[PDB]
Amino acid sequence: KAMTVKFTVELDIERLTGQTYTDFIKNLRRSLATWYLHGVPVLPLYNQEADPRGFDLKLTFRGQVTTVRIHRDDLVLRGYQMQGAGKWLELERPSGHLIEGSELLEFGPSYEELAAAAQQDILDISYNKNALQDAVSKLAVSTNTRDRARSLIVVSQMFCEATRFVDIANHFAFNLESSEPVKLPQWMQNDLEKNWVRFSFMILKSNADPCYKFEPQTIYGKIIKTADELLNFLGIVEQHPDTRSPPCAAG
Question: Disulfide connectivity?
């Protein structure tokens, strides 16, 4: 069962500024929303089993274009299209091919797998406007595994992780037009990105289940004592089916 494409968003990178990038991310969050919790959008997940929902992100720079297909429920990158023939490449994991007619890449969407394919660490890659320009150029035409994987890291960080986290979107916006490299702070990798799934669950289970006990979390060296305070970090919230299980279950 191929992932459907619910909608397409398009951004040109050439005139991109901190402000227009921020606008794009904010609009994308709204486009992705099914419902809202304290003003923060919540992703779909009443749909399950055999209804993979996706969206397309079209990125253009000086006549060069790529389209990336992303899961709408977990914001995981699934594939991208080359410009010449329109050939689709698909990342390993998700199920048979989620993109009809695609060629499978030798890696999945996890950063462990992407970093190995890129032969380069997520924290050693630059995420400014120049890097995004290079990423669309490479994705448009490259058949080189390293180039593809590195470029997919840049797109994943600057669109998927930025969409998920306020502080990440801010960081990339504020540093976007810089001529020097923009690195991702380690706390944003380790405290935020790695915990999106867990934090989303804690937040929705706290809202749903009076018997759920929120455990304080530490982020950027600060203690986050409540689900309300944790929610302030998220731009959009994942919706795991367990969050809809009947509350106050035994145990």
Answer: 211-248
